[PDB]
PDB file of C-alpha atoms in Angstrom:
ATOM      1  CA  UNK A   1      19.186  10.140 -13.953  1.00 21.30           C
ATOM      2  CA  UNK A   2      19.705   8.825 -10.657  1.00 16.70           C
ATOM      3  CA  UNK A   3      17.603  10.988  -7.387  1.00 16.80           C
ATOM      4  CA  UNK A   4      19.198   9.042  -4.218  1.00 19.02           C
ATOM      5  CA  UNK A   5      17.326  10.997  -1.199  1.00 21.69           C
ATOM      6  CA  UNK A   6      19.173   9.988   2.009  1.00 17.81           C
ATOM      7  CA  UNK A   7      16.606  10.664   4.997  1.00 17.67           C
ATOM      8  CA  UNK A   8      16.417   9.633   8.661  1.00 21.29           C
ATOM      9  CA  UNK A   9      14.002   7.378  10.917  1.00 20.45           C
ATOM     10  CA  UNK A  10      13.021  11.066  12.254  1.00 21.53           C
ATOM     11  CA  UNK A  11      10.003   9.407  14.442  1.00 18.08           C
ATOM     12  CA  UNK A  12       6.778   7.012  13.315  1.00 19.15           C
ATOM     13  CA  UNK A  13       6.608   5.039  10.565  1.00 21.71           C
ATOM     14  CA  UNK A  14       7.932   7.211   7.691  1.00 22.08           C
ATOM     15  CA  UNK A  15       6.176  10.555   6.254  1.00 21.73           C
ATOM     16  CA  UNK A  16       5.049  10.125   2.775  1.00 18.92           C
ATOM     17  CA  UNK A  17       2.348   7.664   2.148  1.00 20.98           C
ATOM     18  CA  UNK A  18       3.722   5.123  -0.800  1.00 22.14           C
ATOM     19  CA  UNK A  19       2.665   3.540  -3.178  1.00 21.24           C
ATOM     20  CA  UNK A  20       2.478  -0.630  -3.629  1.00 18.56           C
ATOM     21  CA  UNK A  21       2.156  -2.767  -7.059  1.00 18.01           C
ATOM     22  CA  UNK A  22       2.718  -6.847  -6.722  1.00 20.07           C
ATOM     23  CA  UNK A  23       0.474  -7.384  -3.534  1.00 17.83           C
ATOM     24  CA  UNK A  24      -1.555  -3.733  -3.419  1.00 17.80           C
ATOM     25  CA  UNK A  25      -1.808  -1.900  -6.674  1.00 15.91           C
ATOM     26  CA  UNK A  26      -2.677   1.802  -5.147  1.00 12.76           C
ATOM     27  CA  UNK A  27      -1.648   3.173  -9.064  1.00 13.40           C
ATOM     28  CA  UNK A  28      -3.273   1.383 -11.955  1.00 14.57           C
ATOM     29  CA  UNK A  29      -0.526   1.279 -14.175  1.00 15.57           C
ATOM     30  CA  UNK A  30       2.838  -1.167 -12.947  1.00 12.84           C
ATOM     31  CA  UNK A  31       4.223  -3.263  -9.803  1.00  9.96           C
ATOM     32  CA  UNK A  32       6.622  -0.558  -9.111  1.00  8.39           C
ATOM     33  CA  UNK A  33       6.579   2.176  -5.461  1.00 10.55           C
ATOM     34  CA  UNK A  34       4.924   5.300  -6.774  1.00  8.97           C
ATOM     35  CA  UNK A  35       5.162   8.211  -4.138  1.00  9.54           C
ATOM     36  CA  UNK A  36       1.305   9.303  -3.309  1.00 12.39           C
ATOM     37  CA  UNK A  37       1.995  12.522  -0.405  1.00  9.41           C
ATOM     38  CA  UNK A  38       4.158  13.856   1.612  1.00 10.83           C
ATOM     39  CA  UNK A  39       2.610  14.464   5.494  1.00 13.87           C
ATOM     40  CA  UNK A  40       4.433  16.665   7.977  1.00 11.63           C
ATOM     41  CA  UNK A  41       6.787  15.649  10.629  1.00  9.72           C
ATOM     42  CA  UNK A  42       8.155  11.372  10.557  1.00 10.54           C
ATOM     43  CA  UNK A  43      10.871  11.569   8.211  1.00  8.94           C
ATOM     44  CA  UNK A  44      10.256  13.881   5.138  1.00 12.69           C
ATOM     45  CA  UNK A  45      10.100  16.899   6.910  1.00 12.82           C
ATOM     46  CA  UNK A  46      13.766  16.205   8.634  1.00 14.35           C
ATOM     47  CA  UNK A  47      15.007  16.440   4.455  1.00 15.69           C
ATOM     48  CA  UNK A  48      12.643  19.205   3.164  1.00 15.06           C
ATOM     49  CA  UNK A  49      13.087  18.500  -0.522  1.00 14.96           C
ATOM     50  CA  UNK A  50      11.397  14.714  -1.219  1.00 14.34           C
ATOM     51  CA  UNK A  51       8.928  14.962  -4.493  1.00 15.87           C
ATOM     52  CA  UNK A  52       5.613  13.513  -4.755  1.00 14.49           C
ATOM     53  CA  UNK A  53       4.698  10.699  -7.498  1.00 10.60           C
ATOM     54  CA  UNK A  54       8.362   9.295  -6.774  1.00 11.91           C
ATOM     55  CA  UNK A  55       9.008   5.849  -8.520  1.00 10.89           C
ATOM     56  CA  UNK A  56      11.270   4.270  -5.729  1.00 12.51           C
ATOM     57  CA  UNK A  57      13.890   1.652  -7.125  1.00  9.47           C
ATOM     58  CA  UNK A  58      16.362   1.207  -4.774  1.00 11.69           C
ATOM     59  CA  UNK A  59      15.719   1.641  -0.914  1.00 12.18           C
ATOM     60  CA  UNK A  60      18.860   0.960   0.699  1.00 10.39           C
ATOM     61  CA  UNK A  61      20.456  -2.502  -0.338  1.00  7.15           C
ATOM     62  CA  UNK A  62      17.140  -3.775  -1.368  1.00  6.58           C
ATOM     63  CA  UNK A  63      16.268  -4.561  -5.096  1.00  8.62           C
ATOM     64  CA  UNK A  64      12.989  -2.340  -6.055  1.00  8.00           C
ATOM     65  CA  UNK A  65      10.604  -3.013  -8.843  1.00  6.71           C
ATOM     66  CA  UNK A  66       8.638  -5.588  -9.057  1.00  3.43           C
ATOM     67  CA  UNK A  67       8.002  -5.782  -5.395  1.00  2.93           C
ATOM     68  CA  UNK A  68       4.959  -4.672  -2.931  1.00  5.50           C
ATOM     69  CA  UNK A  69       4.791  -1.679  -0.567  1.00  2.59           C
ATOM     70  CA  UNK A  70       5.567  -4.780   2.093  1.00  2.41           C
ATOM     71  CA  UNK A  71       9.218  -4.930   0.454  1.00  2.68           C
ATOM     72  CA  UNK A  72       9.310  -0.927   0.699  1.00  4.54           C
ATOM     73  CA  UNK A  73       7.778  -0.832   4.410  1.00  4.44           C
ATOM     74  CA  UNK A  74      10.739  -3.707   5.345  1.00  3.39           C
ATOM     75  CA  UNK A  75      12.826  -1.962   3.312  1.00  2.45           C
ATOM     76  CA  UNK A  76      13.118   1.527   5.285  1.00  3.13           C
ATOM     77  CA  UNK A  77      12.043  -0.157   8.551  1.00  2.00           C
ATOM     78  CA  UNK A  78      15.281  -2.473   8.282  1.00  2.00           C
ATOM     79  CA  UNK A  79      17.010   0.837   6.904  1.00  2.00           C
ATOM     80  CA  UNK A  80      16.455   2.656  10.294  1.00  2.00           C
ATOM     81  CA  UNK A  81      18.173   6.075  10.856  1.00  3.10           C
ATOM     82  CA  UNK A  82      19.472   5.909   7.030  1.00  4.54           C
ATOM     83  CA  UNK A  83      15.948   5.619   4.841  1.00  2.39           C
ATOM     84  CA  UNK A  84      17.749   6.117   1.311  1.00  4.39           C
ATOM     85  CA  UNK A  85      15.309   6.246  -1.465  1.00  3.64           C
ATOM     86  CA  UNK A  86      16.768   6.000  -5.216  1.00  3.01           C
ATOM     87  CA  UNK A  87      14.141   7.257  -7.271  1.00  4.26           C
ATOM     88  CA  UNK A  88      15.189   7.460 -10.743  1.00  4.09           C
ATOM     89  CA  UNK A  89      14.135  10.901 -12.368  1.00  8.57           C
ATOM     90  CA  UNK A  90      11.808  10.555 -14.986  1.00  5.95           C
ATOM     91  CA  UNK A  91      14.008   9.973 -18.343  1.00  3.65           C
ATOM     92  CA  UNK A  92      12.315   6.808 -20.575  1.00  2.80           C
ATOM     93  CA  UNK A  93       9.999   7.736 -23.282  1.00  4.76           C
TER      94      UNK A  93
END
């Protein structure tokens, strides 16, 4: 239902490489934060466990839909050491 996936800063920007919709579509399908790869070390490594193609809608306090990777990027920036990524596992038809 509901895959919150509490990480740290850890060092760099993140780790994965997301996806954005409402200002950079990188998947051709809807506005919302797909998950593209996971690279070693930054912030994914320090949880060991984050999936790939990850549809992130809720990143901390911060309402995620319909808005860019710019609203994700602020999003676990403004986060800092508690980058908490609610990805919703797959469940609608």
């Amino acid at each position: 239902e509901y895959e919150e996936i509490t990480l740290e800063r850890g060092n760099s920007g993140l780790g994965f490489s997301i996806a954005g919709g409402t200002d950079n579509p990188h998947i051709g399908d809807d506005p919302s934060i797909f998950i593209t790869k996971i690279i070693p070390g930054g912030a994914a490594a320090q949880d060991g466990r984050l999936r790939v193609n990850d549809s992130i809608l809720f990143v901390n306090e911060v309402d995620v839909r319909e808005v860019t990777h710019s609203a994700a990027v602020e999003a676990l920036k403004e986060a800092g050491s508690i980058v908490r990524l609610y990805v919703m596992r797959r469940k609608p038809p």
